[PDB]
Design an enzyme around this catalytic site. Structure first.
Site, PDB file in Angstrom:
ATOM      1  CG  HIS A  72      -0.396   0.644   2.422  1.00  0.00           C
ATOM      2  ND1 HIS A  72       0.843   0.314   2.928  1.00  0.00           N
ATOM      3  CD2 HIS A  72      -0.899   1.591   3.248  1.00  0.00           C
ATOM      4  CE1 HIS A  72       1.078   1.030   4.013  1.00  0.00           C
ATOM      5  NE2 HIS A  72       0.037   1.813   4.229  1.00  0.00           N
ATOM      6  CB  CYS A 107       2.978   3.333   5.349  1.00  0.00           C
ATOM      7  SG  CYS A 107       2.936   1.862   6.411  1.00  0.00           S
ATOM      8  CD  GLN A 144      -6.786   2.573  10.392  1.00  0.00           C
ATOM      9  OE1 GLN A 144      -7.692   3.406  10.403  1.00  0.00           O
ATOM     10  NE2 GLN A 144      -5.516   2.903  10.232  1.00  0.00           N
ATOM     11  CB  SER A 188      -3.745   5.570   8.308  1.00  0.00           C
ATOM     12  OG  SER A 188      -3.816   4.575   9.298  1.00  0.00           O
ATOM     13  CG  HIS A 209      -4.565   3.350   2.855  1.00  0.00           C
ATOM     14  ND1 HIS A 209      -3.563   2.809   3.636  1.00  0.00           N
ATOM     15  CD2 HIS A 209      -5.441   3.933   3.715  1.00  0.00           C
ATOM     16  CE1 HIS A 209      -3.817   3.059   4.909  1.00  0.00           C
ATOM     17  NE2 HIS A 209      -4.945   3.751   4.985  1.00  0.00           N
TER      18      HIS A 209
HETATM   19  O1  LIG Z   1       9.283   6.875  12.734  1.00  0.00           O
HETATM   20  C1  LIG Z   1       8.759   5.775  12.691  1.00  0.00           C
HETATM   21  O2  LIG Z   1       9.161   4.680  13.561  1.00  0.00           O
HETATM   22  C2  LIG Z   1       9.954   4.994  14.708  1.00  0.00           C
HETATM   23  C3  LIG Z   1      11.425   5.055  14.307  1.00  0.00           C
HETATM   24  C4  LIG Z   1      11.897   3.689  13.872  1.00  0.00           C
HETATM   25  C5  LIG Z   1      13.005   3.591  13.035  1.00  0.00           C
HETATM   26  O3  LIG Z   1      13.653   4.717  12.613  1.00  0.00           O
HETATM   27  C6  LIG Z   1      13.450   2.337  12.620  1.00  0.00           C
HETATM   28  C7  LIG Z   1      12.790   1.186  13.042  1.00  0.00           C
HETATM   29  O4  LIG Z   1      13.231  -0.034  12.628  1.00  0.00           O
HETATM   30  C8  LIG Z   1      11.682   1.285  13.886  1.00  0.00           C
HETATM   31  C9  LIG Z   1      11.236   2.539  14.304  1.00  0.00           C
HETATM   32  O5  LIG Z   1      10.140   2.623  15.136  1.00  0.00           O
HETATM   33  C10 LIG Z   1       9.744   3.875  15.720  1.00  0.00           C
HETATM   34  C11 LIG Z   1       8.316   3.846  16.126  1.00  0.00           C
HETATM   35  C12 LIG Z   1       7.877   4.719  17.124  1.00  0.00           C
HETATM   36  C13 LIG Z   1       6.542   4.716  17.525  1.00  0.00           C
HETATM   37  O6  LIG Z   1       6.141   5.585  18.505  1.00  0.00           O
HETATM   38  C14 LIG Z   1       5.644   3.834  16.924  1.00  0.00           C
HETATM   39  O7  LIG Z   1       4.335   3.818  17.302  1.00  0.00           O
HETATM   40  C15 LIG Z   1       6.076   2.962  15.929  1.00  0.00           C
HETATM   41  O8  LIG Z   1       5.203   2.095  15.346  1.00  0.00           O
HETATM   42  C16 LIG Z   1       7.411   2.965  15.529  1.00  0.00           C
HETATM   43  C17 LIG Z   1       7.658   5.458  11.728  1.00  0.00           C
HETATM   44  C18 LIG Z   1       7.266   6.325  10.706  1.00  0.00           C
HETATM   45  C19 LIG Z   1       6.219   5.933   9.854  1.00  0.00           C
HETATM   46  O9  LIG Z   1       5.828   6.747   8.843  1.00  0.00           O
HETATM   47  C20 LIG Z   1       5.591   4.707  10.038  1.00  0.00           C
HETATM   48  O10 LIG Z   1       4.578   4.313   9.212  1.00  0.00           O
HETATM   49  C21 LIG Z   1       6.000   3.858  11.060  1.00  0.00           C
HETATM   50  O11 LIG Z   1       5.396   2.652  11.239  1.00  0.00           O
HETATM   51  C22 LIG Z   1       7.028   4.236  11.897  1.00  0.00           C
END
Ligand SMILES: O=C(O[C@@H]1Cc2c(O)cc(O)cc2O[C@@H]1c1cc(O)c(O)c(O)c1)c1cc(O)c(O)c(O)c1
Ligand SMILES: O=C(O[C@@H]1Cc2c(O)cc(O)cc2O[C@@H]1c1cc(O)c(O)c(O)c1)c1cc(O)c(O)c(O)c1
Length: 146
Positions: A42, A96, A114, A137, A140
């Site tokens: 997506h 995403c 969702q 969100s 999509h």
């Molecule tokens: O910044 C995002 O993740 C945060 C930083 C990060 C990373 O740098 C590398 C990694 O391996 C994992 C990761 O987990 C972090 C994270 C923080 C949260 O508060 C959270 O709810 C989450 O799902 C995850 C982000 C952005 C997005 O646009 C997204 O869709 C997403 O699922 C996550």
């Protein structure tokens, strides 16, 4: 009898019949061709009213719902014309984090995603792509891969 969600309509510009799906928001000229799990990718475009107006692409997402929809519509046009692959646009533009996997979300069953996303996913046949699908969100484009 058309598959679930599909209806027949008439183009206002040409007068030709076409088909549209009120579950996936897909639309096409061609007359269209349930599993426990499906696999989808997506491309998500968030807007200011997204449940979290933030993504890996942009610390704070300020675009409007309407602006988001225009972006989604342009991406669908490039995908449908073959100018760009779904994967290429997902990697570059999806809000995403699945963008880093060309949009792939892996396999899922009902009860996980969702609800409008889920319904669209399960109404797609393998290979098929949705129109704009709206969730908390954002908006999509969904591609069913398995
Ligand atoms: O910044 C995002 O993740 C945060 C930083 C990060 C990373 O740098 C590398 C990694 O391996 C994992 C990761 O987990 C972090 C994270 C923080 C949260 O508060 C959270 O709810 C989450 O799902 C995850 C982000 C952005 C997005 O646009 C997204 O869709 C997403 O699922 C996550
Ligand atoms: O209602 C018409 O368009 C709708 C509104 C609209 C617009 O404002 C700007 C634009 O870029 C596209 C656009 O598509 C709309 C539309 C809706 C349909 O259900 C449809 O079948 C269609 O061909 C199109 C219409 C009627 C016409 O009688 C006509 O000849 C025509 O070309 C178009």
């Amino acid at each position: 009898k058309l598959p679930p969600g599909w209806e027949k309509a008439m183009s206002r510009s040409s007068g030709r019949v076409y088909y549209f799906n009120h579950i996936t928001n897909a639309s096409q000229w061609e007359r269209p061709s349930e599993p426990a799990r499906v696999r989808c990718s997506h491309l998500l475009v968030k807007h200011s009213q997204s449940r979290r107006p933030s993504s890996w692409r942009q610390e704070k997402i300020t675009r409007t719902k309407e602006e988001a929809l225009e972006l989604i519509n342009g991406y669908i046009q490039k995908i449908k014309s073959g100018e760009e692959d779904f994967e290429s646009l997902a990697s570059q533009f999806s809000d995403c984090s699945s963008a880093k996997a060309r949009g792939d979300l892996g396999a899922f069953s009902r009860g996980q995603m969702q609800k409008p996303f889920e319904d669209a996913s399960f109404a797609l046949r393998t290979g098929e792509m949705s129109g704009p699908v709206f969730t908390d969100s954002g908006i999509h484009i969904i591609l069913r891969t398995e």
